[PDB]
Design a protein around this ligand. Sequence first.
Ligand SMILES: OC[C@H]1O[C@H](OC[C@H]2O[C@H](O[C@H]3[C@H](O)[C@@H](O)[C@H](O)O[C@@H]3CO)[C@H](O)[C@@H](O)[C@@H]2O)[C@H](O)[C@@H](O)[C@@H]1O
Ligand SMILES: OC[C@H]1O[C@H](OC[C@H]2O[C@H](O[C@H]3[C@H](O)[C@@H](O)[C@H](O)O[C@@H]3CO)[C@H](O)[C@@H](O)[C@@H]2O)[C@H](O)[C@@H](O)[C@@H]1O
Ligand SMILES: [Ca+2]
Ligand SMILES: [Ca+2]
Ligand SMILES: [Mg+2]
Lengths: 682, 682
Amino acid sequence: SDLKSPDGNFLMHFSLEADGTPVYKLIYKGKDVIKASKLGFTLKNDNKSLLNDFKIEDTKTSSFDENWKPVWGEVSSIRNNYNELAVSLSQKETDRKMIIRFRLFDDGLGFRYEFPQQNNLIYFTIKEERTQFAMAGDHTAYWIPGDYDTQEYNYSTSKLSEIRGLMEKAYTKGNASQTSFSPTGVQTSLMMKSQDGLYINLHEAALINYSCMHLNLDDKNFVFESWLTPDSHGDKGKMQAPCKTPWRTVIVSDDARNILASKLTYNLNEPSKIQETSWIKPTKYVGVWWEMISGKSTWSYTDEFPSVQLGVTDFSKAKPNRKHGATTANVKRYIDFAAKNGFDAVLVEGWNEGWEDWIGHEKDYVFDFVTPYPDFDIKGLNEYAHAKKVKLIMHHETSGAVRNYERHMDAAYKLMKQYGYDAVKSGYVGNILPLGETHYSQWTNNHYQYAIEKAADYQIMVNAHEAVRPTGIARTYPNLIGNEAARGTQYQAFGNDRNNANHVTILPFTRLIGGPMDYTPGIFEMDVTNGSHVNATIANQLALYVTMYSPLQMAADFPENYERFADAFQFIKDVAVDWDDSRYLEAEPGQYITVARKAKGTDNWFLGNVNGETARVSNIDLGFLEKGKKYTAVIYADAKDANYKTNTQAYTIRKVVVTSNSKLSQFSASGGGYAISFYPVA
Amino acid sequence: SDLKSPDGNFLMHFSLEADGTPVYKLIYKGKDVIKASKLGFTLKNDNKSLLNDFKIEDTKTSSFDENWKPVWGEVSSIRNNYNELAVSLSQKETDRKMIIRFRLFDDGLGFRYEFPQQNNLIYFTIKEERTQFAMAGDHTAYWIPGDYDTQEYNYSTSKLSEIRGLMEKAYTKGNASQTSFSPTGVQTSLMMKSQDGLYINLHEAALINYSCMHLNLDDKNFVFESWLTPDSHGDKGKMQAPCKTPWRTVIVSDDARNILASKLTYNLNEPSKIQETSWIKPTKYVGVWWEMISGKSTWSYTDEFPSVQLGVTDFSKAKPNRKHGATTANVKRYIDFAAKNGFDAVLVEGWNEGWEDWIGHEKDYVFDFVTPYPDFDIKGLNEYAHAKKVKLIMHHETSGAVRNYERHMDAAYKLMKQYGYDAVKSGYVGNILPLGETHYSQWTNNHYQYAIEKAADYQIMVNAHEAVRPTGIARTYPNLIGNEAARGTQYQAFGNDRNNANHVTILPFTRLIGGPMDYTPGIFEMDVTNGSHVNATIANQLALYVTMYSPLQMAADFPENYERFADAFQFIKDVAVDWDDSRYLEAEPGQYITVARKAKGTDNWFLGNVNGETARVSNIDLGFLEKGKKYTAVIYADAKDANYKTNTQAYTIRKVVVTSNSKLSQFSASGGGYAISFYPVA
Ligand SMILES: OC[C@H]1O[C@H](OC[C@H]2O[C@H](O[C@H]3[C@H](O)[C@@H](O)[C@H](O)O[C@@H]3CO)[C@H](O)[C@@H](O)[C@@H]2O)[C@H](O)[C@@H](O)[C@@H]1O
Ligand SMILES: OC[C@H]1O[C@H](OC[C@H]2O[C@H](O[C@H]3[C@H](O)[C@@H](O)[C@H](O)O[C@@H]3CO)[C@H](O)[C@@H](O)[C@@H]2O)[C@H](O)[C@@H](O)[C@@H]1O
Ligand SMILES: [Ca+2]
Ligand SMILES: [Ca+2]
Ligand SMILES: [Mg+2]
């Protein structure tokens, strides 16, 4: 019946309605957070479905409290502490069995359904999940349109009752692959704030062998309902009992900072299944990349032909278009720059045959993932990098041809091992083939999961763009060091509205719940070749190495642009990519975030602040520093006249000595930020 | 404009209608065979398509005449001899380019379309092929319902005008996977006979990177029109220029025998791409097989569970159902029998975990193709077979889960090499996954092609059940040693109407055009465990080793049944499976076929006759024997009272000495036949 968090601040009441419908309710500090909300499923082709006519057959309670050491993360040790209530239901007429297991942490609630082995439910098809989250009122939400194919939108900040009105403007077009489902449909992770000051997050954890959950708002009664991603046949889960859904998560706090600090999502995922983890390596990198994204270079090698056919087109005899990014010469410039600046690795995109046809052609045999272009010396470059203690990050764009990638995967992973690539950036740009498939179906999520597991067997790290947004699986497979799976720094190069000034004050409350993002920060030249304008200050872009947590951190700009602001670049070079502790000092979604983190193995701290549309003075306590020690702090801040629109390169740098007793006050510009290194005094 | 066969008997006229529609016509010995028929395509999302407004830009004629040695076949040397006309078209308003290339052999016509590299047609989608074959009248046809998922039907013999009427009854239900498209749709290869004595076959050749062609009859004008197989999204070809369709084939003769003798289909496929072909091996085999098909055994190992989950179900601890066919003990019986009787191999089905769930569950992770059941000692059995100079044939049923098979394929092929399996029997039973895909789409055909190519790289032969019916590709990839892809001997065990008595007099005129069938002949006990009755006599079943040509010949029955009729079994033991010559002596589709073949490397001949509903005395010209030589003939015949319904086991055996000058005469029962070995006297 009743479940409480270990600290007593949460109560979850479970019951059945008069008609046997299962419902739950969640209360925080005596205030409704989830009102009476219904549970269960509509099945396809079924006499009854799983909405009602249950009775309670059994309940079991338990408790758990253990720590586990992540391979990489914000802390060196994570606490998994909950109470558990496991309700065994039996449906009348069908004798069908369905367990609903709840775990209630000090950060909030997670629940999921299990179907044990049974005689009258075996193979079955989910037509819709009917899992509800009834809100207590017309809350503020930070949201992006529900989509089966992209998450690449600007967030909207509005009341729940305003989402219908704002859907037309918020649903931005021009994407290679995007599909709407509802005038009131949004993605998770969904962030909200109530009128009475509660921060409420709705998400899921352990998305495996299942369809991605979106939410559909009933904007009359303020009920969000699970809405899963259809597959190529319109199905929302081919299930086989015994099976189990992913957890649904409600993360709550009266203090926005604790939302960011929460590990609930990881804690709901099963323990690492990789026994030996020292080959997984947090990575700071540059790449041949922004060149193409910002309109200076091509991924393609030749323009000679209407189309290309791998194994037929002789690229060694084709006319070079002279614009191609991934030349031996150019890849060497980025290696040189990485080695000189203490960076680990270098991404190269457009190294392989096929790029002439990579987008909008819905092509199956689009890449072989193994054959270099004639101007890219794979052997020499990997030798040259390795001699400079640098690695290349492999790039595997699939262009939606999942079968084609799967057939090539083994040989492509082997070619990585052969040359000493240990990490791959993968991509799923365009509609998934065959047409009618979606990016976030059960079918396609299986593929992303398969890529990761196989990667692991080869001791290869994965960072997967356009994949399903993460749900904590990195605990289980910590070689998933990244996803994009959200609107990244790249949209700052794509004109239109680029990224709103407060984007990076919302991502940590939404997309980062479930895992890190490859955000590709560190832009210093905001006015790029193709006319686009990045909406950030330099100090902003420095702070992202701390405020957008990731074991995979790019410095996305060109070496030349870093040489123009060497003094500011010092923070990017200094900052760590893995942490023993982390403290969120200030946070309010859509306005600002300020966080300090202790570099793993060290007594060094790195702090960042990111700030939204409204210029603001940030006031912090430096008592996270160790008592009795002096530290050199180097503050990289916005100039007073900086702004993300018309004065993006105005920064200051100053040195002052502080202790655990010190306070700090710092202006942040509109769309700006600050960054601090703290080194103990010698 | 005009094209002639090298012997003058065929004339094909090409032209444009006033509206620019391309059309062809075919004449044989002054008789219309193809009346004015239209060519081209309906494109998706294209106002104008490729139906008309062409003009002729160029024509090129040529000739070719060469022989080529197949690896395996009916003959030691095949003659490829045609005249070629290549018409280059250009569409007005679109500048689109389309070649139509015709080759005219002494056996008939093939043509296809090519799209060369061009500036205004790159990626495009075929909505329907618009290739016609206008008949001269209401011909007799031997046909099966048009289907995107099965060819496992009984043939119907009727007039073209009768097909609409007969469709309901001919479209038999109860198949795991079957989808109709038209009340007048039929499959190819389609056999016809005109009122005035022409044998007309309509088929295709080199079905690669393209959708399978069916025909839809307009039964008002007796025009058949290409009707391709939709994919999961309803498409009939995702094309990229430069590309090219398969050949469409019209094989004609005034003598039915020449239809069977024709190699036109092979001749239109490209030369072998396997350089070294001695590992490809015509194979006579038995197997643990019929036991399951005929209801005596299970593929499954246990009945203990509602469903199974690979990696989770512990089969070592499951309750054996003791019906399971593929035990070490039982597989040894068939090895012992193969070795003792000069057979090459032993198929085993149900050797691997998963079989509890193999049919109609639409299960993805249905098999791993590597993990033996706990009662099948893969190592001991392969050692034991090899030490008795026998091989096992691997069985890979996919149960429609193509992605699952593809992911497992490399390791499954490796496990074959590890234990000395060199041939695999594959299967595609149930709907293709994901749901909505078809068996004979471009997408799925790509999969069958991929299996074969990869098989070749491992030096593995492939025999694929429920795959697309063959179109001559074995020339190009002679490791494709068979397909089922029609109604096989198995339906003789499936009750209902089993196989019509004259089935095996139709298959050579239809399904065998394009490649051999694994028909699994050689039944001696016709009344099997589950009550079903095989509609053949014993002499019939001996004759199939010659009248259903295959480099892969099964003796389907149980060793016990062969040991009981050892005298008759002698033919199965003696007969060869590869040939240096073949002569079709008599043939009439749906009535009889009589053919004699010379065993490769030998002076031995083997003759078979199969006979339809009507009992018939056959008169055999033995002029194919070498002049002035004496031969021992052993005739295995129907007794005079034999009959496929009520007296299936009454056979005689006599020896007589013959020469090329002998003519001898033999009764064949209703659904019966005869078989003869010819050995030169010592
Ligand atoms: O692997 C290469 C590249 O792939 C991903 O980025 C590709 C990105 O391309 C398109 O973006 C278009 C924008 O949506 C429009 O709004 C803009 O107008 O034009 C761009 C350029 O095509 C796709 O539509 C989009 O879905 C896709 O993500 C990786 O994220 C990137 O880092 C890679 O380098
Ligand atoms: O690898 C297993 C087996 O697969 C193929 O044959 C399987 C065959 O199974 C079904 O046949 C059914 C018939 O449709 C019904 O008419 C009959 O009554 O019952 C049987 C079994 O339910 C599928 O429906 C059918 O499409 C499929 O081809 C191979 O051909 C065989 O050799 C293999 O051993
Ligand atoms: Ca992207
Ligand atoms: Ca079959
Ligand atoms: Mg400037």
